[PDB]
Amino acid sequence: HHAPSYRVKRMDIAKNDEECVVNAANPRGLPGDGVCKAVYKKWPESFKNSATPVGTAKTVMCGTYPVIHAVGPNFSNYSESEGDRELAAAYREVAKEVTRLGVNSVAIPLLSTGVYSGGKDRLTQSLNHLFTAMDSTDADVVIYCRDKEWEKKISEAIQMRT
Predict the structure, then answer these.
(1) Please, which residues have CB within 8 angstroms of residue 10's CB and are 6 or more apart in sequence?
(2) Reduced to 3 states, what is the DSSP secondary structure of residue 67?
(3) Which of left, alpha, beta for 37 (phi over 0: left; psi -120 to 50: alpha)?
């Protein structure tokens, strides 16, 4: 009867200690930048046939370790309305993959907050969708960020729900 938890860590997600990782992927399975680039530096072979549409997730196993490539929308290309739907869908596929894989924990970045943000602060939007999808899962979720003010805000958002 372990208590499923949410935690935040301010560090490179490629160094995670969880049972699987969510990559903030692009649709074509390219090395990309930011989080995707850091994931490519550690598990480049996880990009073998990882291309998948926006709003979906595709898991590639690296030995026993799952890399869940979750493709959020680029808000430079998507409208606020359609991008919101796609961002929800990506996270819903993450929850389904995490459940299917039977993992006890998962490392997850905030989708669509880096170069896909359209130059808007999307912390609250992305985190809200992350919770909406992951709340009904029982895996321990560890959210990764790099910015210290973002760490504070994510931590505050987690603490205030209980």
Answers:
(1) 144, 145, 146, 147, 148, 150, 151
(2) strand
(3) alpha
Inter-residue contact 24 to 36 (CB < 8 Å): yes
Beta-bridged to residue 62, according to DSSP, are: 65
Regarding the domain with residue range 1-162, which homologous superfamily does it belong to in the CATH classification? Leucine Aminopeptidase, subunit E, domain 1 (3.40.220.10)
Q: Which residues are annotated as a binding site?
A: 12, 26, 34, 114-116
SS3 73: coil
Torsion, Cα of 60, 90, 155, 103 (10° steps): -40
Burial of 161 (0-12, 13-18, 19+ CB in 10 A): exposed
For the annotated binding site for ADP-D-ribose, the residues are 12, 26, 34, 114-116
Please choose, from the candidates 150, 100, 103, 105, the residue with its C-alpha nearest in 3D space to the C-alpha of residue 126. Answer: 150
Tokens for 96? 């389904």
